[PDB]
Amino acid sequence: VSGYVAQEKLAIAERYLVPQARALCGLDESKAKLSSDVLTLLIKQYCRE
Amino acid sequence: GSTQGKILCFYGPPGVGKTSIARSIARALNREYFRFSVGGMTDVAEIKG
Ligand SMILES: Nc1ncnc2c1ncn2[C@@H]1O[C@H](COP(=O)(O)OP(=O)(O)O)[C@@H](O)[C@H]1O
Q1: I need a surface site. Which of A10, A33, B24, B41 has the fewest CB within 10 A?
Q2: Considering Cα of A46, then B3, then B6, then B12, what sign does the dihedral take?
Q3: Which of B2, B4, B1, B8 is nearest to B25 (CA)?
Q4: Binding residues for ATP, per the UniProt record (chain B)?
Q5: Chain B partners of A26 at a C-beta cutoff of 8 Å?
Q6: Rounded to a whole number, what is the distance in Å from the CA of A40 to chain B's nearest CA?
Q7: End-to-end C-alpha distance for chain B, whole angstroms
Q8: Strand, coil or helix: what is A38?
């Protein structure tokens, strides 16, 4: 297995990561939306790994 | 809703009141207090047994 491209992390995190952590805090999407724009800013800036 | 976890740390020069606020929060939330130093510990018998 390899690493991941900057854009690639977006398609991961919107599906396979965000809902999981949403189940960790026990909320549903109805009250805690997180747009794509927040995700691209996150991965582009705050985490280079 | 429910209680939620997160870990937290305070840091600064010794004796700033770190542990003091710890216990103060412990009696704020009403949770029980228990210090556990781990500076320089090595053996696994004191952590896992
Ligand atoms: N704002 C504050 N209010 C009350 N006590 C303080 C404050 N700042 C520092 N102290 C004092 O600093 C000392 C440090 O204690 P503590 O936080 O319990 O452990 P540590 O030495 O690891 O910081 C305590 O005796 C405490 O009274």
Answers
A1: A33
A2: positive
A3: B8
A4: 12-19
A5: 1-2
A6: 24
A7: 35
A8: helix
Task: State which approach was used to obtain the coordinates.
Answer: cryo-EM
CA-to-CA dists, residue A21 to A9, A24, A49, angstroms: 16, 5, 20
Residue with CA nearest ligand 1 atom 10: B17
Q: Angle at Cα A40 formed by Cα A25 and Cα B8, nearest 5°?
A: 40
**Cα-Cα end-to-end distance for chain A:** 15
Q: Tokens for B11?
A: 């840091």
Matching residue, tokens 């997160």: B6
- Binding-site residues from annotation of B for ATP: 12-19
Instruction: Report CA Rg, chain B.
Output: 14
The answer, for A26 touching chain B at a CB cutoff of 8 Å, is yes
